[PDB]
Amino acid sequence: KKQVTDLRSELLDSRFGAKSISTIAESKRFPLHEMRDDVAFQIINDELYLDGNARQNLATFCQTWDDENVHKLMDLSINKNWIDKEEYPQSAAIDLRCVNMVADLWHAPAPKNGQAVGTNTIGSSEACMLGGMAMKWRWRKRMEAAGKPTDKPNLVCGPVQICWHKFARYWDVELREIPMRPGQLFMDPKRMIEACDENTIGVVPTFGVTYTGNYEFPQPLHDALDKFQADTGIDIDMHIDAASGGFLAPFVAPDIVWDFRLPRVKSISASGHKFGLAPLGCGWVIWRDEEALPQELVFNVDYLGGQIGTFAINFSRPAGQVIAQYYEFLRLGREGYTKVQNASYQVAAYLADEIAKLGPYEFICTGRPDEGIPAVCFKLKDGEDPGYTLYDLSERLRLRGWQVPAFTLGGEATDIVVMRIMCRRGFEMDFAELLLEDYKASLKYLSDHP
């Protein structure tokens, strides 16, 4: 009799009065029985409230808002496999159009066969790894042509994102990172060259440093590499990590020469899901030409009577993000992207100007299109003590749901603590003004409770 009465309750009980929702969710072993689908969904939906409100997460560089058409395109493509070119041929075609468009945006030389050399990825990490492998292979071929050993490769870079550290570790390459230091939180030409030698597989400038938000300019570095070859005969290539800058500079600062306009730039990577406005799960890596991508790294697959070259670390994955990316390209175009990015810079500039009035801060990034990305980065003026640290301010802001990271820089600037505010699409002026209000209140509090 109990079984039937229990089952009756299973059918009729409300979501929160149900027996199945009276226990803590499994966290150690694979569940034994099936359960009400509404209760399973409810529990998980509710647990996710413990994640931070994405729109208030001012620490991330990734998109936290997508328009309705992208939501639809994503749902519609939830089961389209990006890797199966023959099974989802139009998704594949759309992908190839994006490759052309991004290559064009970065001034890659026009492809004679009508198709640029490059590929979509899950993000900049995979894109960078692909660029790094190609870089390492081109170096090997150069050394082999010279009759020199290829067992001690190194890579020269500045304050790179962690993915390059993983590349170095995973592909056994010695990472030679020029450390940040007071006065120059980036890789300068002089220190770059001092780290270069015949075993350097390449140099990686970060066109939009994550820690500060400022651009490392490839041109001055390119000049130094030209002189290095003239003096030593050593020819070093560049791969630009433009995770953020790749989808900013072309629109608001087109005259900064950082891309394929520079001879030594053999490849560039960027995150479509950062300022490229695509939903999480989209990255891009373009090569200046076929010569820049070693064929031994490319796996060809049948496609519409012919073949297409593939270079990826991942295999199966959703094609929704690239479809969404194409949508943004067509819907916004240069005009639309410029308007959206200009909106972010205006917000960044506004906040930097207003926050400067509230305390003894020294700004590292103030939302200037010509210097970096739409971000605000600052620190307390040396020797100044307003009665609080940027860590305390970060915490107070969190009480209102905002995630504004405060952290120490690296290298020779480990004693410097900075606060960074990322101004992405969806962080409109009105919304940013609310942050400003909370910022003033927080300081107000820290003042009444020193």
Ligand X SMILES: *Cc1c(COP(=O)(O)O)cnc(C)c1O
The reply on whether position 64 binds ligand X by CB under 6 A is no
User: How many residues in the shown chain lie near a second copy by CB under 8 A?
Assistant: 154
The entry of a second copy, ligand X, none near residue 34 (CB within 5 to 8 angstroms by kind) is a second copy
Pairing of strands 238-241, 154-157: unpaired
| 124 annotated among ligand-binding-site residues | yes
Q: Segment 405-434, which members bind ligand X (CB under 6 A)?
A: none
Nearer to a second copy (CB atom), residue 109 or residue 182:
109
| 60 annotated among ligand-binding-site residues | yes
Q: Given candidates 42, 184, 389, 408, which one binds a second copy under the rule CB under 8 A?
A: 42
Of 181, 180, 178, whose CA–CA distance to 224 is shortest?
A: 178
The token pair that represents 210 in the structure block: 């994550």
What are the backbone angles phi and psi of residue 167, rounded to the nearest 5°? Answer: -60, -50
Distance of CA 47 to the CA centre of its chain: 27
Q: Are the C-beta atoms of 110 and 286 separated by less than 8 Å? A: no
Label each residue of 50-80 as H, E or C. HCCCHHHECCCCCCCCCCHHHHHHHHHCCCC
Q: How far is the CB of 240 from ligand X (least distance, A)?
A: 10
The reply on whether position 226 binds a second copy by CB under 8 A is no
The reply on whether position 325 binds ligand X by CB under 6 A is no
Q: How far apart are CA 338 and CA 449, in angstroms?
A: 44
* 235 Cβ contact list (under 8 Å, min separation 6): 142, 229
The reply on whether position 241 binds ligand X by CB under 6 A is yes
Eight-state DSSP code of residue 182: T
Q: How far is the CB of 371 from a second copy (least distance, A)?
A: 22
Q: How far apart are CA 361 and CA 156, in angstroms?
A: 32
The entry of ligand X, a second copy, none near residue 27 (CB within 5 to 8 angstroms by kind) is a second copy
Of 10, 235, 225, 204, whose CA–CA distance to 139 is shortest?
A: 235
Nearer to a second copy (CB atom), residue 15 or residue 381:
15
Pairing of strands 283-287, 118-121: antiparallel
Q: How far is the CB of 324 from ligand X (least distance, A)?
A: 15
| 271 annotated among ligand-binding-site residues | no
57 strand-pairing partners:
403
Taken in order 386, 387, 391, 393, the sign of the CA dihedral is: negative
The entry of a second copy, ligand X, none near residue 210 (CB within 5 to 8 angstroms by kind) is ligand X
Nearer to ligand X (CB atom), residue 221 or residue 243:
243
| 125 annotated among ligand-binding-site residues | yes
The reply on whether position 176 binds a second copy by CB under 8 A is no
Q: How far apart are CA 321 and CA 326, in angstroms?
A: 9
The reply on whether position 398 binds a second copy by CB under 8 A is yes
Q: Given candidates 252, 332, 349, 358, which one binds a second copy under the rule CB under 8 A?
A: 332
Q: Segment 115-134, which members bind ligand X (CB under 6 A)?
A: 123-125, 128
Of 67, 103, 106, whose CA–CA distance to 256 is shortest?
A: 106
Task: Tell me which H or E stretch contains 154.
Answer: strand 154-157
The reply on whether position 243 binds ligand X by CB under 6 A is yes
Residue window 137-166: x/- pattern of binding to a second copy, with contact defined by CB under 8 A: ------------------------xxx-xx
Q: Given candidates 120, 206, 341, 442, which one binds ligand X under the rule CB under 6 A?
A: 206
Q: How far is the CB of 314 from a second copy (least distance, A)?
A: 5
The reply on whether position 244 binds ligand X by CB under 6 A is yes
Query: Annotated binding site for substrate: which residue ranges?
Result: 60, 81
- Which residues of this protein are in contact with ligand X, per CB under 6 A? 61, 123-125, 128, 161, 163, 206, 208, 210, 241, 243-244, 271, 273, 283, 315-316
